[PDB]
Design an enzyme around this catalytic site. Sequence first.
Site, short mmCIF file in Angstrom:
data_model
loop_
_atom_site.label_atom_id
_atom_site.label_comp_id
_atom_site.label_asym_id
_atom_site.label_seq_id
_atom_site.Cartn_x
_atom_site.Cartn_y
_atom_site.Cartn_z
N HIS A 43 0.82 -1.21 0.00
CA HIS A 43 0.00 0.00 0.00
C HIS A 43 0.85 1.26 0.00
O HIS A 43 0.41 2.30 -0.50
CB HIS A 43 -1.01 -0.03 1.15
CG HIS A 43 -2.09 -1.04 0.96
ND1 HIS A 43 -3.42 -0.73 1.04
CD2 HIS A 43 -2.05 -2.36 0.65
CE1 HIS A 43 -4.15 -1.81 0.78
NE2 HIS A 43 -3.34 -2.81 0.52
N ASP A 69 4.16 -20.68 1.51
CA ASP A 69 4.04 -21.92 0.75
C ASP A 69 3.04 -21.76 -0.38
O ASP A 69 2.44 -20.70 -0.59
CB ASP A 69 3.66 -23.10 1.67
CG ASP A 69 2.33 -22.91 2.40
OD1 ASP A 69 1.60 -21.94 2.07
OD2 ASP A 69 2.02 -23.75 3.28
#
Length: 319
Positions: free
Chosen positions: A47, A194
Amino acid sequence: ATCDDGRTTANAACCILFPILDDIQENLFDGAQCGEEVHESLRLTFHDAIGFSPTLGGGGADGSIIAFDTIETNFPANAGIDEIVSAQKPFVAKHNISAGDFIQFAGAVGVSNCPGGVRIPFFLGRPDAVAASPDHLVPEPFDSVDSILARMGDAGFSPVEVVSLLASHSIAAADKVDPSIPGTPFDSTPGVFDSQFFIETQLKGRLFPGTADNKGEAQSPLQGEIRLQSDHLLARDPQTACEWQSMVNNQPKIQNRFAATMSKMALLGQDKTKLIDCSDVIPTPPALVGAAHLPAGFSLSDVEQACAATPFPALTADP
Ligand code: HEM
Ligand SMILES: C[As](C)(=O)[O-]
Ligand SMILES: [Ca+2]
Ligand SMILES: [Ca+2]
Ligand SMILES: [Fe+3]
Ligand SMILES: [Fe+3]
Ligand SMILES: [Fe+3]
Ligand SMILES: [Fe+3]
Ligand SMILES: [Fe+3]
Ligand SMILES: [Zn+2]
Ligand SMILES: [Zn+2]
Ligand SMILES: [Zn+2]
Ligand SMILES: [Zn+2]
Ligand SMILES: [Zn+2]
Ligand SMILES: [Zn+2]
Ligand SMILES: [Zn+2]
Ligand SMILES: [Zn+2]
């Protein structure tokens, strides 16, 4: 170079980071965990950085979201950001680095706490921000794929780079999409960097984990997980689906591509040749825990395969 407490780093200017590292690991990241504040700090890197448009202005990875918090945190796409900005601000005040540097440093330190994670290259020396980001520069979960890719492309990222960056959603949750279920993760392993995110977003949706009519939310496959409509679409759209699937059970690719594209993002609006490389201060991440799998009771037939060229790989399921 050897710093005053005996720790070493290639470039002596980087020594100033060691006390900052220690402070944030304990007091931001709850003792070097891959938890809420890591997730929030990683979101903050984006952001801050994505407030960068040749046409529209904004200085990118410049700390503007902290320096000009009063303006930026009220943008709709920055909902919930105020919490991590307020948490980070006292660290910036106490230590002697710019807000832009701090945001990227905290994000890189945080990611390094996550099993399977990476060390995002980190450069020191960003000047203080001189302008607020314009509004309407941060993608939203109800935006189209065309819109998201155009915005990210405007900032300098190709569609494959967008997919790479969205590996962040492997260590991520939502508080504002459905405020009845704050803290619901985007994958089943929000403490592990992952490929579960890329698997689980490909499953057929089944349920809403909270309420059923939230803007920007899609059905999830699992009670414990929330799905963004943007992720639903990016996993399936012909422009991005093949890259999305290529991440599944491809930990080396997720690692390499996330680190490289995060470095690029961390440097939006900046010139690496005017900064000092302090990458070696970031901790060594733990190795991946767990392996790629379908949820218990699921099978390949629950996957909505979206890559014409390459079938979805054969995965085992949880017992
Ligand atoms: C490209 C389009 C993207 C969209 C539409 C999007 C959308 C969202 C939304 C809606 C949330 C939940 C906010 C809330 O309700 O609390 C979220 C969380 C998050 N985003 Fe993404 N995002 C995008 C890209 C990225 C990228 C490039 C990064 C890289 C740093 C990132 C990192 C995160 C993280 C780590 C969180 C978790 C925050 C937490 O746990 O509180 N996002 N994102
Ligand atoms: C132009 As937009 C990133 O606010 O949908
Ligand atoms: Ca900024
Ligand atoms: Ca995960
Ligand atoms: Fe302020
Ligand atoms: Fe300063
Ligand atoms: Fe200053
Ligand atoms: Fe929150
Ligand atoms: Fe599982
Ligand atoms: Zn905490
Ligand atoms: Zn929080
Ligand atoms: Zn927080
Ligand atoms: Zn200090
Ligand atoms: Zn807008
Ligand atoms: Zn939008
Ligand atoms: Zn959160
Ligand atoms: Zn499309």
